[PDB]
Write a protein that binds this ligand. Structure first.
Ligand SMILES: Nc1ncnc2c1ncn2[C@H]1C[C@H](O)[C@@H](COP(=O)(O)NP(=O)(O)OP(=O)(O)O)O1
Ligand SMILES: [Mg+2]
Lengths: 51, 428
DNA sequence: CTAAAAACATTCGTTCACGTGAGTTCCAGTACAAGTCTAGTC
DNA sequence: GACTTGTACTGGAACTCACGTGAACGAATGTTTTTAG
């Protein structure tokens, strides 16, 4: 269990109540793939350069 | 090449293959000359996202493989190449593009005469004040700082020279800074001018009067030397003897008196037991010209004969009529007040005699020749680093219950893995 | 002049790359407490 | 006072989760233009 955000419901500029938002229904995805060097199966990184 | 006087070489390690290829292609398009492989023809080299120091490491590894006499290229950054490509011509090169003093005093020789007399005197005064206050640790640390300052090969003129010196914290650094910047230090004068310091120094010089007795007298209202003589009923033999011969014992001794006393003691020991050998230890063995007492060590090269030498020699000297004070009026130690007749009359000078067999002779000599601070530091180093216990009698190993006797003092230092120092270099 | 084929335009699901906010937990740094400072004789 | 050892605190970084932007790729479906007979 984890709160996506803790927000403030404002009935009026002077009246504020703290609330928390949760996702009781979330889509399921496969774990992200990770790139590996072919020759040694050592993890690699991707760097983006603009020039 | 449009510019025959320019030869640019890139670096693969950090830039990468693709970036190197693109930059080389762009430079070739712009008419520049780019060398595929490093060679002597290269005049400038460009790095990228590399620290300057690391770049130097690259240069040296390339210098060893080049013929001698070749002018080294000039280090440059990718910014230079980018600016040159953007402006269309090579831009001018600018700045952007382009074991020690061991803590222990036993490891550092300390000559008697140094170039930091004032600072050492101030630190000694502070240490004496701390000792009077009753804090032994403060005295020890101040003495260590003074000793460190004493061993400096060159005079100290700027605070930056105190960084690497051990046993130099906030207080000592501040004291030295005050001494250097303004000359006389405020704290030193404040402590010295204090009446308590002066009266404690006056009382301590009395033979048989320590710090505790001096403080007790100070808190009892006793402030002057004469006041002590007004109540000669709360003083032991030592205090009475010291107070009576105060002026005589206040004068530092000279070397001629040492020679006369040595001759007298040599005659006494020779007549008492034949073959006795006497060695002069203490400050006078370290090269000092002045002292407070004369210290001797008596031994017999043959093993097992100095069982009761000292009482016989002491009683013989007393019969001769020279001992004003004997510690005990079988012992192997005594301090006295000799009666030296001056050639012009006589003056009282203290003399200490200690006996030790030949087996324990080197240890006794080492323990009775070096300074107090040097002995403390050597014993601490032996106990902590090497785990052995060193005392005036011998060196002992808690693990193996066997003594480490030796036939010479050099072996004592050799066993501890320490460079030998002469007696003149053991001053604090 | 008409029909077939090629090219172009728009939409849709999926995967990948990065960036950014929020919540939870670990850890490396900093502060402070306490011990030590030499060894012996008398 | 200076150093060494041990304990406690704690603010930030790392990690995870979730969403949004931008791009490529296949894939489709439809629509428009060009060329052959
Ligand atoms: N507290 C101590 N701890 C260890 N060893 C010590 C010691 N005190 C002395 N020794 C050792 C080392 C000492 O060298 C020796 C006795 O020396 P002194 O006669 O007490 N003082 P000196 O004659 O050297 O100098 P000056 O003429 O200025 O008074 O015993
Ligand atoms: Mg002496």
């Amino acid at each position: 269990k984890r709160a996506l955000s803790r927000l403030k419901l404002k009935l009026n500029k002077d009246i504020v109540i703290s609330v928390g938002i949760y996702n009781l229904v979330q889509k399921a995805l496969k774990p992200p793939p990770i790139k590996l060097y072919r020759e040694t199966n050592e993890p690699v990184k991707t760097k983006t350069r603009t020039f | 090449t449009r510019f025959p006087g320019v030869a640019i070489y890139l670096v693969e390690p950090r830039m990468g293959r693709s970036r190197r290829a693109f930059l080389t292609g762009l430079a070739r398009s712009k008419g520049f000359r780019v060398l595929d492989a490093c060679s002597s023809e290269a005049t400038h080299v460009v790095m990228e996202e590399t620290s300057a120091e690391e770049a130097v490491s690259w240069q040296e590894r390339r210098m060893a493989a080049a013929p001698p006499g070749c002018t080294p290229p000039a280090l440059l950054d990718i910014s230079w190449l980018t600016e040159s490509l953007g402006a269309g011509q090579p831009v001018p090169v600018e700045c952007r593009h382009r074991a020690w003093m061991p803590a222990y005093a036993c490891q550092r020789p300390t000559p008697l005469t140094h170039h930091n007399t004032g600072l050492s005197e101030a630190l000694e005064i502070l240490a004496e004040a701390a000792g009077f206050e009753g804090s032994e640790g403060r005295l020890l640390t101040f003495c260590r700082a003074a000793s460190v300052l004493k061993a400096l090969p060159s005079p100290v003129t700027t605070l930056s020279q105190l960084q690497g010196l051990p046993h130099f914290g906030e207080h000592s650094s501040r004291v030295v800074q005050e001494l250097l910047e303004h000359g006389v230090c405020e704290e030193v004068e404040r402590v010295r001018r204090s009446e308590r310091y002066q009266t404690m120094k006056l009382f301590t010089q009395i033979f048989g009067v320590g710090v505790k007795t001096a403080d007790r007298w100070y808190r009892e209202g006793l402030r002057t030397l004469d006041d002590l003589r007004e109540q000669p009923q709360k003083l032991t033999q030592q205090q009475k003897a010291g107070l009576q011969h105060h002026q005589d014992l206040s004068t530092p001794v000279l070397r001629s008196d040492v020679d006369a006393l040595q001759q007298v003691v040599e005659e006494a020991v020779g007549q008492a037991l034949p073959g006795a050998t006497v060695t002069l230890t203490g400050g006078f063995r370290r090269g000092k010209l002045q002292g407070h007492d004369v210290d001797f060590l008596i031994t017999h090269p043959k093993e097992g004969q100095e069982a009761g030498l000292l009482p016989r020699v002491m009683c013989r000297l007393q019969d001769q009529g020279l001992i004003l004070y004997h510690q005990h009026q079988a012992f192997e130690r005594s301090f006295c007040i000799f009666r030296l007749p001056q050639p012009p009359s006589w003056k009282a000078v203290r003399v200490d005699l200690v006996v030790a067999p030949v087996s324990q002779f080197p240890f006794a000599l080492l323990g009775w020749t070096g300074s107090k601070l040097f002995q403390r530091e050597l014993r601490r180093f032996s106990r902590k680093e090497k785990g052995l216990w060193l005392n005036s009698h011998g060196l002992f190993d808690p693990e193996q219950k066997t003594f480490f006797q030796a036939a010479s003092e050099e072996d004592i230092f050799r066993h501890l893995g320490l460079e030998y120092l002469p007696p003149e270099q053991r001053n604090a």
